[PDB]
Amino acid sequence: PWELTILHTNDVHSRLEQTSEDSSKCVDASRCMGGVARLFTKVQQIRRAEPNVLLLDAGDQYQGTIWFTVYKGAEVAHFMNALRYDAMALGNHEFDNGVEGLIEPLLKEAKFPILSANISASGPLASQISGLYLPYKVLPVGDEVVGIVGYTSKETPFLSNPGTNLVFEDEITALQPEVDKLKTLNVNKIIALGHSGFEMDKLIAQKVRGVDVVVGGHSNTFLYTGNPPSKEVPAGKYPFIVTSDDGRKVPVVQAYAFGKYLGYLKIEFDERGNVISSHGNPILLDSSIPEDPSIKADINKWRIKLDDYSTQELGKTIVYLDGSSQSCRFRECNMGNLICDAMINNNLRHADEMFWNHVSMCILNGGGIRSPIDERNDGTITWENLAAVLPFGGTFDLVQLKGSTLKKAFEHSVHRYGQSTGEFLQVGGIHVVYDLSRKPGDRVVKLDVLCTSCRVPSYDPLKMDEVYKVILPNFLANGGDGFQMIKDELLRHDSGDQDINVVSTYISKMKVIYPAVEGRIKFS
Amino acid sequence: PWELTILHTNDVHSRLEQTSEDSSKCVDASRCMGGVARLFTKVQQIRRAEPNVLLLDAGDQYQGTIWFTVYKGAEVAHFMNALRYDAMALGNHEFDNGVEGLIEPLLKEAKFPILSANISASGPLASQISGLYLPYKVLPVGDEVVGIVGYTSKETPFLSNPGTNLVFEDEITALQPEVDKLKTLNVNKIIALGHSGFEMDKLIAQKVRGVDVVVGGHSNTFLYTGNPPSKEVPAGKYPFIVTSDDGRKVPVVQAYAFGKYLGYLKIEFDERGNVISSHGNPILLDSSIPEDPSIKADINKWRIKLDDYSTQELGKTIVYLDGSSQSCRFRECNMGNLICDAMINNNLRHADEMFWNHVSMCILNGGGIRSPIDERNDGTITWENLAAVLPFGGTFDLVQLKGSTLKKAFEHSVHRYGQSTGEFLQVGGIHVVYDLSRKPGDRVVKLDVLCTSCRVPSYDPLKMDEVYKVILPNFLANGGDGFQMIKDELLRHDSGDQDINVVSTYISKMKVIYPAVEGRIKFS
Ligand SMILES: O=c1[nH]cnc2c1ncn2[C@@H]1O[C@H](COP(=O)(O)O)[C@@H](O)[C@H]1O
Ligand SMILES: O=c1[nH]cnc2c1ncn2[C@@H]1O[C@H](COP(=O)(O)O)[C@@H](O)[C@H]1O
Ligand SMILES: [Ca+2]
Ligand SMILES: [Ca+2]
Ligand SMILES: [Zn+2]
Ligand SMILES: [Zn+2]
Ligand SMILES: [Zn+2]
Ligand SMILES: [Zn+2]
């Protein structure tokens, strides 16, 4: 039997440096995790021990920290090249800077193939991008070859900025003919590597005949066999076994996010390319693994431009930006309005005749706003100033919520009002009126929301049965601050852009800001 | 006696082309007025007849039409040079593009002196601008000399964008020592040429010892002796005679605005430079005076780039811009909100620790919004599209109104509601609630306004005795649409930027707009 070791990462999201246990800024070095210098140490160790190794990335290296803000993907090409990745699938966030922000920095500079079989181009873009990404690549491994076939979320137009010259095809429709073609070319060992989420990965393992292994991403899915080594709770065993329509056992793997773990799957194949066995587990990249000194010194050299950028003026405010707890945990605060307005601006996607924009609504825990910004430094706002307001390393995610769920969230917002607790919600595209003299759970007396399916945006009463798109912190999507109803009742969840980066881009665009308190939240 | 003919213009405001009787777009050529080609004909005719002539401009050539938008002052230097102006005073609108937008295009290219005795610079700007404008110039006229001493509104920081490196001194304080200096230099004929308004011009004639004649601007003041030749109603005789503190009779002149008239004042001086007599009248530049063919052909050549610019994309909308009468004369309309938001953005001036901005409030007659803009031309907005929305050639002016006056204006807004009349007001920085079941005059049931004297902008109830700054169309400042209370009760009025240009600059800054209907105007 021919044994292959698959090493894999996904949704690394700009975590070039080691991180805290929750993937935020490293504070206590002796307990920090991940980063590319530590990953290098572990990959090097495995390649010294195992003859047949592939190192794969399932997309979403782009977006997550100031590294991406400043280097715009040049850091991805440089450090993935240094780690000698064998292949990468395109994720949704590889489109955050448009097709031009993908072609240059990443597609032209990567020394490995970049894959997606379900993205097609038209017009002059088709000629410009031809061959810079591939449906698949056949790679030599020892005396054998392995086909790797890519895929990317069909939902990418709603979750990034790919433009109107790319079409994202149904994954299974696009994959099947490519996998059948590889069989005609005597390629009997096939990996599907791609970026659609665990649920789609299981459908691909079930329905795409000839796929031996699925290596996925997007949903930040943690899988594990045995007692978990850290705080992430597994969604299933590692690998997750799907029984295919043709009766094979197909392993499905993912490795959480943020470079905290290295996926590690051993596959035994027979002479005909059938999987005999599969086993493994993600490896926690904790402090017991030393950071490679050479990669660490290069990271520290690249950090100088980040430190310089962090104190540059992004733009100006002519108003005090009130991010005080006394304001933002008790009433509408103009820092809350700014952040929610930045969140909606970040989520303007391709227009369509059925909506002015796909999403119009924002909620934000007031306890997540951690500092004001004074306007008396000649109005200057810097990244360092925003990092004081938003220090947690979160994202502003897209969810679908029934109106009933959102009403329950606004009741929870004020269920114990008056104690300076963090659950009080700041908003955008929502007008709420509370009556605090009513019983907890029955304090919301008006709730109006900005339409999407309209050419002129206007407010209408919230409907209990209707599903709304809402932008909100990942902290709330995951049920933080007691918002268990959001976690338990949401219909869709996709991870969005870095919190600081969303606000910095908005301020840079606007140049001069003056957010008001305007009656989004009232008390009767 | 030595006779001087003073020819003068003021507040020409980018009217390079001939205009309608109301200074808007020329439609019926055979009845059009003004423009630089016609002015050339008349100035040439007078210079053939009168030996001692000066042609003077009292400021505010900048701002008013697409000429300024595109050529940014290069058209002012070119066509004032072609007319051989002898001198110009700086007006407030010469600062609209900052000090850099004054130095280059105008101060470096004018072939005549540009004057202001009450503007001082500090820091590196002082070295950069030294000598490019002058307090005064002594000009030879025949065998004599005449001193011309400039001045500019002390209020310019509130009415334009001069920056924080220029100081505007009290006019009389600055002028007196310059006029006394000219006497020490054997200059006994002195003209004060400047841009502070008729009321300040009369104070200068009264108090500045040695001034023989005041040639002013800013207030668009029409003066005439006899039956007026057109629709402008005179504010007084031409010249207006002030009795000075030293007992001399000092003529004060102005010539309306928009290049419709050429001021014409004959002065007789004795050997010692005392005024013996003064007489004249502005000359209506009507169609009985032919446009100079050479200047007309040059105007037509310069127009090609304006025609090209008028169909270029300024920016995009992702929302229908509802400028329909059915919306904007009956309820809050998102085109109204856009225009008012552009008006406030245009009036962001130098911050100060006593206010976030000096003005926060806007009102706009809904009958002044003349077209929607469809978002389905790939979202494009052009200048031509904005000129359909705002076709009247107006300005967005700054006034001071008591709260009582503004309440009366909001009552008038709905006094005959339901007839699709133009007086219904669109707003910014104001939240109004009407109850139409009440009697006319008592329909306003809530009126809240955005603070200025605050670090965090918020809404408070309007106070009847407090004075508010408001941005509004010149049509309303002049009592149009039956708003007689505004004209009769306002405390201050300064003319602002061209209506189209205000909206075009805002859209260009924003890049992508999505104005909502958000509850600025409600009905109970
Ligand atoms: O990781 C996080 N992300 C976002 N908000 C957080 C996080 N951890 C704490 N918070 C907020 O911080 C509040 C507690 O702050 P404290 O009352 O100042 O200790 C919570 O109620 C949350 O609103
Ligand atoms: O010169 C002008 N400037 C601004 N608005 C004007 C002017 N002339 C007319 N209007 C507006 O046009 C309305 C009349 O439009 P109509 O009902 O469509 O004929 C008036 O009630 C005003 O609101
Ligand atoms: Ca196989
Ligand atoms: Ca004299
Ligand atoms: Zn991701
Ligand atoms: Zn993703
Ligand atoms: Zn003017
Ligand atoms: Zn002026």
UniProtKB/Swiss-Prot annotation, chains A, B:
EC number(s) stated in the UniProt entry for this protein: 3.1.3.35, 3.1.3.5, 3.1.3.89, 3.1.3.91
Binding-site residues for Zn(2+) 1, renumbered to this chain: D11, H13, D60
Activity regulation info: Inhibited by adenosine 5'-(alpha,beta-methylene)-diphosphate (AMPCP).
Molecular functions per Gene Ontology: 5'-deoxynucleotidase activity; 5'-nucleotidase activity; GMP 5'-nucleotidase activity; identical protein binding; IMP 5'-nucleotidase activity; nucleotide binding; thymidylate 5'-phosphatase activity; zinc ion binding
Subcellular location: Cell membrane
Cofactors: Zn(2+)
Protein role: Catalyzes the hydrolysis of nucleotide monophosphates, releasing inorganic phosphate and the corresponding nucleoside, with AMP being the preferred substrate. Shows a preference for ribonucleotide monophosphates over their equivalent deoxyribose forms. Other substrates include IMP, UMP, GMP, CMP, dAMP, dCMP, dTMP, NAD and NMN.
Descriptive protein name: 5'-nucleotidase
Naturally occurring in which organism (per UniProt): Homo sapiens (Human)
